[PDB]
Amino acid sequence: MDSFKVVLEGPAPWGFRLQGGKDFNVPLSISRLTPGGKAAQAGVAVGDWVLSIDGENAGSLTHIEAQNKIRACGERLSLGLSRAGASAGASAGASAHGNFAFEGIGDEDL
Template structure:
């Protein structure tokens, strides 16, 4: 099930998530840590969520660093589309 989650920040706040994966890892971009009380936590992001879109743009073809740059450079808000409770196996 895809869920759109909007995060809004002010000042120098971080989004409050740590990610793993990306096209260069042959594994979907996955939230591995959520900062307790941070923006992502308050918005409902959970560890294990798989991010499929940023602001409506599909990201499965992007490398980890490209996704990181898009999140760092996002101004005050970002909409993450996530898939929750999906079991995947890493391609070897």
């Protein structure tokens, strides 16, 4: 699989989430990604497999830690993703109706 990187730098916050847990022998990946959001600008899509955060390998950090790595960002955030197989998908037209899933979240949101 061909790996790649994506750095998102901007004034406003991000609009994506993360999950998994290295400590729990679980890989890190994006939980949710708002349509046309900040992360989307860089070309990120929910489902991808996270390899590193803020230019630092996330193979030593846990789920909760992974978040702090992003929020800690000050100038720019550099994340690394890879080509996943049958990860997941989404819908764009749904936006027209207002198909969202953001509410009572934040603990993991970024």
